Amino acid sequence: IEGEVVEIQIDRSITGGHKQGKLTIKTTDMETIYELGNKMIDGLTKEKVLAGDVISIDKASGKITKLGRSFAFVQCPEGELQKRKTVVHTVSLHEIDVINSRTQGFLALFTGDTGEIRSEVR
Amino acid sequence: KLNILSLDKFKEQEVWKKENRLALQKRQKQKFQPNETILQFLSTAWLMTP
């Protein structure tokens, strides 16, 4: 989801039990109002966004990525807010081989302190 | 006449089922209430130039 953010409202309670957030997101051709819950609230707070700084957000990932300020410098982004695409990933066979070897085997991609991977994994 | 009245009652029961299912879909189960009687912070980002 990418567009020119217009309004951001955050309603967090001090010594309370809940928080809330309301956003106004608008493109050149349409606008819609949405209300946030918990994950996107903390993602927005941790990555500082104002009325002038424009963003991309994924539903499943939940990650909030800066797309450059429109002002305060680019024109208003066009097109529908929703965008479905595909992202490709290339992983060499050795890295799948090692990633499943041990619970700490992922670090061997960097430190390399692995070896003698059991033949029952290959 | 009694059968016409029964038909009317059947039709209004059917529309009652319709209205009940639409109301069930539109009612939601929101139990958040994130206001409380306690201090709470608000931040607003917008544009103001008159």
């Binding site: 002038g52 | 206001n35 912070f41 931040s43």
Partner: peptide
């Protein structure tokens, strides 16, 4: 129109 250092209201809630 992007004037000033991005005014951000700091509001309190509730009375």
């Amino acid at each position: 129109e992007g004037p000033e250092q991005l005014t951000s209201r700091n509001f309190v809630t509730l009375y």
